[PDB]
A paper describes a structure:
[name] is a Golgi resident protein involved in the maintenance of the Golgi structure and regulation of intracellular trafficking between the endoplasmic reticulum and the Golgi. However, in enterovirus-infected cells, the [name] [name] domain interacts preferentially with viral non-structural 3A proteins, which causes re-localization of [name] to the sites of virus replication. In this study, we present a structural, biochemical, and biological characterization of the complexes composed of human [name] and the 3A proteins of four representative enteroviruses. The crystal structures revealed the details of the [name]-3A interaction, the 3A-3A interaction causing the assembly of the [name]-3A heterotetramers, the interaction between the [name]-3A complex and the lipid bilayer, and the roles of these interactions in facilitation of enterovirus replication.
Residue numbers in the entry:
A (entry chain A): 368 to 436, 474 to 528
B (entry chain B): 16 to 55
């Protein structure tokens, strides 16, 4: 049994990108037609995963898969969200011991690379 | 501070200020991903 994720947005994109550039590299440049996958392993102490992402000039494909410990459950289906307008955020409870797969999918984009500002947290 | 309470907090009210407060309170721990896969 897997719990449904929580998903929302918040209006301030500028404050987000400003702080992401601040902290680390933490910015994925997604080439034309490329698909980047960020692997976030689950924490024993941790119950929850939190993700935030935004883009500069264009939308990008985003979804979340959970890999067990190779079966794959679909947490967030991959669709095109507009992160250039606002910051997209979400959270999910651990189904168990495994690894989260954060998908950034630029495949549909012929001529345009995508700069992805993202951040990750976990509770406990 | 229960995890589901932290989630409802960030979901209901969300800003860099709240993100930093939760961080400072240890309610959320920043995490660097282990690997980044690329492909076409």
């Amino acid at each position: 049994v897997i719990a449904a994720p929580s998903m929302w947005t918040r209006p301030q994109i500028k404050d987000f990108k400003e702080k992401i550039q601040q902290d680390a590299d933490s910015v994925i440049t997604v080439g034309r037609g490329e698909v980047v996958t960020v692997r976030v392993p689950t924490h024993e102490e941790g119950s929850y995963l939190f993700w935030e992402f935004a883009t500069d000039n264009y939308d990008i494909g985003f979804g979340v898969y959970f890999e067990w410990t190779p079966l794959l459950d679909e947490i967030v289906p991959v669709y095109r969200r507009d992160c250039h307008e606002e910051v997209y955020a979400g959270s999910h409870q651990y189904p168990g011991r495994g690894v989260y797969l954060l998908k950034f999918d630029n495949s549909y984009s012929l001529w345009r690379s995508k700069s992805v500002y993202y951040r990750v947290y976990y509770t406990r | 501070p229960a995890p589901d309470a932290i989630g409802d907090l960030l979901a209901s009210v969300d800003s860099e200020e709240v993100r930093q407060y939760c961080r400072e309170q240890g309610w959320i721990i920043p995490e660097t991903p282990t690997n980044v896969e690329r492909h076409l």
